[PDB]
Amino acid sequence: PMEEEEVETFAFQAEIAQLMSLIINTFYSNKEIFLRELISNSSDALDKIRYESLTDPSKLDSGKELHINLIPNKQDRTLTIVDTGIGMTKADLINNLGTIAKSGTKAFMEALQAGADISMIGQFGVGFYSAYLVAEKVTVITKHNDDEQYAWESSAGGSFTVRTDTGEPMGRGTKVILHLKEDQTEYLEERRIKEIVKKHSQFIGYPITLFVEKE
Numbered sequence: 001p002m003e004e005e006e007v008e009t010f011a012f013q014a015e016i017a018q019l020m021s022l023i024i025n026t027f028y029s030n031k032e033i034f035l036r037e038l039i040s041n042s043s044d045a046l047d048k049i050r051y052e053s054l055t056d057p058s059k060l061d062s063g064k065e066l067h068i069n070l071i072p073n074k075q076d077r078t079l080t081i082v083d084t085g086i087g088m089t090k091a092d093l094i095n096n097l098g099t100i101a102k103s104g105t106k107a108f109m110e111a112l113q114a115g116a117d118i119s120m121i122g123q124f125g126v127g128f129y130s131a132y133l134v135a136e137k138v139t140v141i142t143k144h145n146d147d148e149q150y151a152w153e154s155s156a157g158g159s160f161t162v163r164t165d166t167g168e169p170m171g172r173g174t175k176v177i178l179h180l181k182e183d184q185t186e187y188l189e190e191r192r193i194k195e196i197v198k199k200h201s202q203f204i205g206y207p208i209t210l211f212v213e214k215e
């Protein structure tokens with residue numbers, strides 16, 4: 001029988017929308033840094049659950065392994081980054097993925113306008129948005145302890161959606177699914193992914209596994 005699901009559509013905060021339009025509509029040469037930014041957010045989320053587990057060990061009931069998985073899919077042109085970190089509550093999601101102003105937004109846009117390399121984004125606290133250098137649409141699935149699994153999605157254009165996820169349960173953590181632009185398929189290649197992780201994400205304190213679909 002027909003199922004019904006509630007959806008909430010939100011507008012991005014003005015400067016976040018302006019930043020996303022700048023990232024999408026301007027040429028940048030060193031786009032590979034998007035992966036460093038997402039792995040760095042996963043590493044931070046893994047530290048959060050690790051430290052919380054020291055006080056309340058039952059916070060690991062949802063999965064004891066602390067790690068990052070990278071899953072390129074050449075059939076549907078997606079690159080997925082999964083972690084078993086702390087995950088996001090509904091408030092963490094709506095607050096960190098678009099509704100709240102970030103102190104570094106205006107400074108970062110002015111710095112990009114002056115010729116700064118896109119690699120500077122992380123320093124400004126808006127590193128996630130680098131996903132739009134390579135992706136036309138980003139889906140974020142997240143699961144925090146004592147809360148439901150949520151799905152966030154945006155193709156930019158000024159809006160994002162949030163819904164309770166009725167899909168595949170994750171025990172705990174965050175999955176970022178990058179629906180790559182047609183000209184950015186190099187980020188589905190095993191060699192290219194290894195190259196960029198070696199260059200930019202070599203001091204990550206958690207194991208990372210790259211899953212490669214048999215050719």
Ligand SMILES: Cc1ccc2cc1-c1cc(nc(N)n1)Sc1cccc(c1)OCCCCO2
Pocket residue numbers: 041042045083085086087088089092096097128140174176
């Ligand atoms: C997908 C995402 C986008 C933006 C972002 C964090 C994550 C983001 C968030 C998380 N995990 C992953 N992998 N990415 S868990 C989390 C939960 C609450 C607060 C968190 C992180 O960080 C607060 C600092 C700002 C983080 O900004």
